[PDB]
Design a binder for this molecule. Structure first.
Ligand code: HEM
Ligand SMILES: CCCCCCCCO
Length: 401
């Protein structure tokens, strides 16, 4: 309906209302590398096709991550130094320092702890009564995992969920009312983690992220802003994406009862379902780059300093890359063929830990409630107002047993 030159896919309302899909379909068909002059976030390029996103991801010497990796320009948290928002060489050193916490030798030891925690959380759910899945399952388990990643005082766990929400929120969406309040609450995050750092620098490293960072020579002189940037990366990385994936799967099985039927008939399909849930959800809708020089991408002239947006949410629905991409299919032959974890030097380091948490939830769900329709959505979900976080504030669920 709207003239092509004035499509603004970044409009946060489109993500809350779940209407953004159509605009991305339109851009994929008519103008896959689309310039937007007017938005909440100033001008930017939209890269909407799987092939073109792969192209941007694999040319970091052209498409820099340096200052910021989001479309947001007024959010002072996303402009803090963080290794996701760094080019090589500094990026490579800081990624290697965090990578060990989510290394498979440490994911075997974690599998048992995730299973006991998951079991206990499901055992505490009410039966034949509506509850909020996001509060009782998704926030609950993902927060527990992030506390363990940080060796965070378990009694203070909920602080992690808050800091995560504050880092990514739009002003006046129910989280924080101004940038001054965002930085005030994140000051408390830096203060808390600084106490933990002081206890763990100058003593043998623990297996916990604060220890790993305090004992990597390149990170030892970090300013509180540098420390806070990496903290919020790890905090939003280590809860919000898995959280929205955990919620997303319940919704996807309820919208597609045929797939819920296949799953219950063959619980081995969890192996191929989990990657599909992560594609379907695309918990981070996009990632931003900044052109360091004039370049051509899908036959378009991108200028020096231009903001480029890789819309994973569009790429994961690209029929050129994925057969029948708008269907939720839990038994795809190549179900890990998606952009939800991105690609290239910044490819998600936590992807195996995210998939491990999701596998264990679905295993433990089916051991207790194995029949199709038992985990039922009984109300519309409340979606997040963001072009970055594609997630759920609430999801009403009733377990029929
Ligand atoms: C469903 C779950 C998850 C999704 C969808 C997700 C998605 C992503 C995406 C898109 C990126 C940027 C990739 C790029 O631009 O090419 C990323 C990076 C990252 N993710 Fe995740 N992630 C998830 C889970 C996790 C978890 C559990 C951790 C745990 C600590 C984590 C830590 C990171 C970190 C540290 C980076 C920065 C990587 C770098 O620049 O080298 N992520 N993730
Ligand atoms: C602004 C907080 C960090 C945003 C990037 C998180 C990426 C986790 O996959």
């Amino acid at each position: 309906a709207i003239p092509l030159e004035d499509i603004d896919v970044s409009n946060p309302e489109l993500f809350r209302d779940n209407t953004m899909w159509g605009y991305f379909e339109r851009l994929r068909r008519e103008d896959p590398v689309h310039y937007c002059k007017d938005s909440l976030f100033g001008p930017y390029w939209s890269v909407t096709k799987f092939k073109d996103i792969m192209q941007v991801e694999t040319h970091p010497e052209i498409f820099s991550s340096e200052g910021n990796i989001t479309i947001m320009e007024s959010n002072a948290a996303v402009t803090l130094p963080m290794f996701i928002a760094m080019d090589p060489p500094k990026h490579d050193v800081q990624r290697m320092a965090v990578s060990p916490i989510v290394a498979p030798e440490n994911l075997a030891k974690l599998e048992g702890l995730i299973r006991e925690r998951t079991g206990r959380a499901l055992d505490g759910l009410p039966i034949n009564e509506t509850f909020d899945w996001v509060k009782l399952v998704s926030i609950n388990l993902t927060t527990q995992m992030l506390a363990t990643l940080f060796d965070f005082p378990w009694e203070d766990r909920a602080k992690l969920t808050r800091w995560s929400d504050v880092a990514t929120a739009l002003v006046g969406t129910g989280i924080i009312d101004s940038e001054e309040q965002r930085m005030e609450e994140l000051k408390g995050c830096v203060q808390y983690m600084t106490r933990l750092w002081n206890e763990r620098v100058n003593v043998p490293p623990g297996n916990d992220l604060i220890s790993m960072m305090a004992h990597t020579e390149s990170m030892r002189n970090m300013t509180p802003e540098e420390f806070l940037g990496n903290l919020i990366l790890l905090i939003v990385g280590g809860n919000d994406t898995t959280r929205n994936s955990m919620t997303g799967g319940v919704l996807a099985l309820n919208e597609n009862p045929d797939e819920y039927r296949k799953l219950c008939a063959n619980p081995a399909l969890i192996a191929s379902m989990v990657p599909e849930i992560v594609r379907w959800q695309t918990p981070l809708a996009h990632m931003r780059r900044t052109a360091l020089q004039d370049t051509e991408l899908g036959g378009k002239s991108i200028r020096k300093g231009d903001k480029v947006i890789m819309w994973y949410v569009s790429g994961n629905r690209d029929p050129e890359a994925i057969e029948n991409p708008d269907a939720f299919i839990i038994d795809r032959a190549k179900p890990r063929h998606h952009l939800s974890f991105g690609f290239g030097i910044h490819r998600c380091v936590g992807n195996r830990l995210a998939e491990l948490q999701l596998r264990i939830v679905w295993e433990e769900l089916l051991k207790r409630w194995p029949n199709p329709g038992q985990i039922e959505v009984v109300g519309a979900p409340e979606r997040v107002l963001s072009p970055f976080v594609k997630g759920y504030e609430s999801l009403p669920v009733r377990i029929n047993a």
